[PDB]
């Protein structure tokens, strides 16, 4: 019943936090591109 | 409709996993260029 909506809401959290961690990883790769591109 | 939300969770999860394979590749590429420059 609400046993499974409870497990889904928790899953949503992990997915959201994965999206957020990957976003930091994306910004980090932009930073590297901008540094390498400027140096050359 | 609840079985549809659970499979939407699986779709998003596998998409995040594919995104992560691509992040791995771009991080590798940036590293090859960094040590080269």
């Amino acid at each position: 019943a609400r046993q499974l909506l409870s497990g889904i809401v928790q899953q949503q959290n992990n997915l959201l936090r994965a999206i957020e961690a990957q976003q930091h990883l994306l910004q980090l790769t932009v930073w590297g591109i901008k540094q390498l591109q400027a140096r050359i | 409709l609840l079985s549809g939300i659970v499979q939407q969770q699986n779709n998003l999860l596998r998409a995040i996993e594919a995104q992560q394979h691509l992040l791995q590749l771009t991080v590798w590429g940036i590293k090859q260029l960094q040590a080269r420059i």
């Binding site: 497990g7 899953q11 997915l15 936090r17 990883l25 | 999860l13 996993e17 992040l23």
Partner: peptide, 29 residues
């Protein structure tokens, strides 16, 4: 750049954990 490599490893490890924990929650619901 040295801080960059650390932030990479940091978020990489954190993502792979979240993926692991999300696939167990999925192998449940």
């Amino acid at each position: 750049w040295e801080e960059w490599d650390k932030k990479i490893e940091e978020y990489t490890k954190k993502i792979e954990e979240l993926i692991k924990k999300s696939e167990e929650q999925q192998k449940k619901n």
